[PDB]
Amino acid sequence: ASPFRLASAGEISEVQGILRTAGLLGPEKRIAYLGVLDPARGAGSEAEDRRFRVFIHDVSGARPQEVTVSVTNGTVISAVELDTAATGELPVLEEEFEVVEQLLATDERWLKALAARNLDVSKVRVAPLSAGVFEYAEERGRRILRGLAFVQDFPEDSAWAHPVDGLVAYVDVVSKEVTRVIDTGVFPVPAEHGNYTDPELTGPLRTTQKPISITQPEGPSFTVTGGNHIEWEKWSLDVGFDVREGVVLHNIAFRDGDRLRPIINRASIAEMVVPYGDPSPIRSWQNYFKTGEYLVGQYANSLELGCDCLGDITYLSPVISDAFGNPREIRNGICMHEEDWGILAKHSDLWSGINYTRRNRRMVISFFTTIGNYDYGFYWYLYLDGTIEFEAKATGVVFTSAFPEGGSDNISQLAPGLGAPFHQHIFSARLDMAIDGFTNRVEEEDVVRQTMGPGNERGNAFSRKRTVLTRESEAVREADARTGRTWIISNPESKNRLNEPVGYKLHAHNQPTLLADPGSSIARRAAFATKDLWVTRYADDERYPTGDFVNQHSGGAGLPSYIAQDRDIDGQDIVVWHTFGLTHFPRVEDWPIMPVDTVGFKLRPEGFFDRSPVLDVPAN
Amino acid sequence: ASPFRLASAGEISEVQGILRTAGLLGPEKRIAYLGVLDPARGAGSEAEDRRFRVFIHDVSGARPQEVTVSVTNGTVISAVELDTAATGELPVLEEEFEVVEQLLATDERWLKALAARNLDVSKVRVAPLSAGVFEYAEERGRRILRGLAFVQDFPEDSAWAHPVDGLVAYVDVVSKEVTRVIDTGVFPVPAEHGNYTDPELTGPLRTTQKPISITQPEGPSFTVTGGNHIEWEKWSLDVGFDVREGVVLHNIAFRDGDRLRPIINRASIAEMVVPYGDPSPIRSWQNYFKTGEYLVGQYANSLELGCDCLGDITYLSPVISDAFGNPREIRNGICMHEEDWGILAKHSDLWSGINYTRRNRRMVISFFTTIGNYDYGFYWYLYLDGTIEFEAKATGVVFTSAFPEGGSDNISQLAPGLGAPFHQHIFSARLDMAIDGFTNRVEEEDVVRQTMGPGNERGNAFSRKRTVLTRESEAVREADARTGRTWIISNPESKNRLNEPVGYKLHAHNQPTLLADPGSSIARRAAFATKDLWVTRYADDERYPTGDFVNQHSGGAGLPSYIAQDRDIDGQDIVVWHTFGLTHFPRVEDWPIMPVDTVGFKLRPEGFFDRSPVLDVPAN
Numbered sequence A, B: 001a002s003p004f005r006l007a008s009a010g011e012i013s014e015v016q017g018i019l020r021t022a023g024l025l026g027p028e029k030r031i032a033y034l035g036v037l038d039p040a041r042g043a044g045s046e047a048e049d050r051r052f053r054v055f056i057h058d059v060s061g062a063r064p065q066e067v068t069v070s071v072t073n074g075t076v077i078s079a080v081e082l083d084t085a086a087t088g089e090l091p092v093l094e095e096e097f098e099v100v101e102q103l104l105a106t107d108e109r110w111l112k113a114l115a116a117r118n119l120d121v122s123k124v125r126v127a128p129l130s131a132g133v134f135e136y137a138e139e140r141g142r143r144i145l146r147g148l149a150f151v152q153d154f155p156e157d158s159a160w161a162h163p164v165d166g167l168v169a170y171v172d173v174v175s176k177e178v179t180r181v182i183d184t185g186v187f188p189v190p191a192e193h194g195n196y197t198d199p200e201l202t203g204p205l206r207t208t209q210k211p212i213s214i215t216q217p218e219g220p221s222f223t224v225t226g227g228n229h230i231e232w233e234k235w236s237l238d239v240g241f242d243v244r245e246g247v248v249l250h251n252i253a254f255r256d257g258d259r260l261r262p263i264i265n266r267a268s269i270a271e272m273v274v275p276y277g278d279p280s281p282i283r284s285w286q287n288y289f290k291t292g293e294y295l296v297g298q299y300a301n302s303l304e305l306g307c308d309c310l311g312d313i314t315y316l317s318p319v320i321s322d323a324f325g326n327p328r329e330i331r332n333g334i335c336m337h338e339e340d341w342g343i344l345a346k347h348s349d350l351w352s353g354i355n356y357t358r359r360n361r362r363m364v365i366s367f368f369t370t371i372g373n374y375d376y377g378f379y380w381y382l383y384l385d386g387t388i389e390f391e392a393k394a395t396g397v398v399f400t401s402a403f404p405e406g407g408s409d410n411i412s413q414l415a416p417g418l419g420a421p422f423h424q425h426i427f428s429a430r431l432d433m434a435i436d437g438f439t440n441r442v443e444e445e446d447v448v449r450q451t452m453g454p455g456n457e458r459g460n461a462f463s464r465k466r467t468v469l470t471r472e473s474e475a476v477r478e479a480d481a482r483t484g485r486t487w488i489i490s491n492p493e494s495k496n497r498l499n500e501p502v503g504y505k506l507h508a509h510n511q512p513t514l515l516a517d518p519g520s521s522i523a524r525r526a527a528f529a530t531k532d533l534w535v536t537r538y539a540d541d542e543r544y545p546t547g548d549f550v551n552q553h554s555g556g557a558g559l560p561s562y563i564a565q566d567r568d569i570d571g572q573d574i575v576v577w578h579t580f581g582l583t584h585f586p587r588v589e590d591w592p593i594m595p596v597d598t599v600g601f602k603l604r605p606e607g608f609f610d611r612s613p614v615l616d617v618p619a620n
């Protein structure tokens, strides 16, 4: 009976029924987004009322709507018509991506471009990409997708090995018309194939790898109740799933002695943008907002035991809605398991004669998603010592282009004539903090060097300083690896036995942030990506760092708008938004299929406990 | 057979015999250091000539000597008398450490200080620490150790919980004289115990941890031949061990098709310093050069199966010399095993319909050492994809002091009246590079942001630049996390199929470097720690960033002196010295025994291969 339980197939069917009966789901309507709403602040009087938020698109050109329904009472709470030219277009529908290639196939301009290159239209695949907002005034209020071509020689061929450069088209997916076809010139289409399962490319497979058996004879140490409530080594939390954000962690708490202490109320990856840095007009508009425009949860893979998740695995099979309101289960879309994590603590003391060693372990909650050529893994980790960590694993096939004769300052060569445009993968982790409760504050901590002189005669001293972020106007921070900068979230009203506010310290990897020019469209639409840490006052309607309707929005939505309210964040209900990502200059080793690369962050207790919280761990 | 084989008990006994025969090892002599020398460059010597280098101390006060012997020919190659006041004292002898507490127990000044604090001398343990170089003229040319007191209430009590602040003594361990006893005032001695095995403190042990079984039914995938030659998933290398550096990796190479391609000739942690940042006269001289002053290898722990190393483990038991030249085995001092490392590569392609997933693995070579209250683990990893990584794991018990009543800017409070002075753990990895051979060069690579305008009208473009370090004077570099700075080691004479020099990219964690004032004794003695990367031209006698004799040695040797030669490093036999470490502001969670914290670095192939090197990994 938990308010955080996963949505059932029936609940989705109920939403569909409610919408249909209300006359909001006619033949031309499509569900672009559907997700359950989290309980509002308080809920003292559990008025069990499951509500769902829905974005309804209209393939007839009619205005879309944002609808909130109660499946508990079978009613429509609200239905507001949207003006997309102002607030943004709805997420792209899976069915719209498909129309791009089909439409271009009958367009004379597109056919002429292919004919000049001697490419069989039946062999040309088109990657349907988001459009963004640039200089095309005629696109305002219109639902546009831009297409890039790749040649697939046969059904099992990897089209990514054969990009068709110098060609790009724009399509209005509603009116179903090709608005523009741009041909800047012919580029040779890379000839080598990139079929990583072809013996001629892989060569003889290795026979040197001996098996590694990972098993748990007595089962896992974690328990799963209520379908998604996890309890493991003092940790307590609920594993949620949203079609937009994917796996979402709720009510992360730690059992300290006789009481369950909250740490984080809600943790999620609220946005993930992939901006490309190739100035060619063929791709200079390319920016993927995987979470906001595509909805990462929708493309979560069904994970295979022994392949994707090894060991004693417990799966969750979340249900999402299709474009018509029908429930669709993502079988084994979420993996949950614990794993050994080496030494936790060790000391061999000469004086006491006591030799002490203890092993560490971590709870893993993950899912993997595939969008076009991209495949990303999202992993959340909980450690015995109270550490919380997130890790993104990037793999898949690199997005390609032709490699210009004479070289390039924005593209790397992967194979003869095959290029890989430079780009970044930037994430935003939204952490609704709850350190021992909702009264929290954030301090920026920097190492402080000291000068040799009075009070420091030997010049060996060093210290640190903490600065409280009191208002949102001063809560947009940047990293400073040189000074070991971190951010501490504490509760000024909850102190440890040493009379110090309890807290958790966020450790960033300090990777580069958004590189685009400050005046670019992407810098405006993905402003969150330009700074490492943002702190806002909690608000029900502030869910994503990029706003609710990211697709083709002019910019400034999300964090920049929230921060502008300049609210008090010193000892209040606050939310931390951490930006982190990878800057990718593709290497030859990333082709034909990319070995995993990673990025993330972690938070460690900082005076949260009265002493080490793992003294009760037994000897293994 | 192999000139890179581990030293045998017989070789050590032979060195002892050769030294004795030469009249260099009488009863007053002690072996402060003994290690096998790596073979010289080029196939000079026909067969293999095994040579050992020894530092010989004299307990009567006579000048020590540095000697090189040929165990093969039974001859002394060179023997030079050392002027320690100039070039440095020899490493501390394990036998000198116990001298301190013993001598102080009968010193009137020390006894009076203890009586003023109402402490029973029989219960006062003394931590004998390296002295460094400061303003004490009488210490020049003498072997000094400085002692700090801790109370041990009973046999199995953790003395670290009871520091005796305001007191420190200096001792000449050769003449066995207490040179000075400094008492700055009585501080309350923390009363709470820190016994982590006491149920009173641990509380009932957890019974919630279910077993995790990791086994290999068909045995490990790596082979060990010649006692220390490893072959694993295309990797080839020799695992060496030196009493000073600990585990050293030799001839790291990768089998690419029909060629064994070298990558790194020698990899080791050439120095490790732990500088303290508390300006109190009681500890302002505290700087542990664990590698250079103590010799970390001799303190390597015997690792227990199922506790320290889990899974199918293969052990090496290196042999070192004791103070008299007798061989001593460190049973199971080195652990070797392979472990699963999640997903290696994955992609589910819509167009081809092919779903591909491969798992990763890594080879682990490690050892753990204990020096006083510190316990550090050194781990080297080799990955299927060609990545090489190092990781240091810090644990043990934090060094304590009293926590001043009025607070402190250089000490954190762990318990009532118990403090933990701020400090750093800084390592120097010496990487004698051999990317496809010895003709190498290093380039510093920075991300390059571009301004919106002609050629970049949308302001989305970004690039990078590479600067070749051509001479040693230009090869002392600092990190720049903000610009994603990395360093690439390439071979300008060996190109991949795309006509680009093959290389490897070094990725640093970009943690803060040495914080001490540049004019401090420690900034001069640990000069290498003030910069992130140094590149030198290979030289037989340039082994450590701090020189051969670190104990009580001022600046003048090491990296700063090597770089002065300003040698050509553009396409030559070069060595990369990477500084990396942790800055520790102790938390309450670090008490009474510290949970592991880590730091390290890694190198990934950068155009070294012609495509991904893991296409031949099976699905299994």
Ligand SMILES: [Cu+2]
Pocket: A394, A423, A424, A425, A584
């Ligand atoms: Cu990428």
Ligand SMILES: [Cu+2]
Pocket: B394, B423, B424, B425, B584
């Ligand atoms: Cu430390």
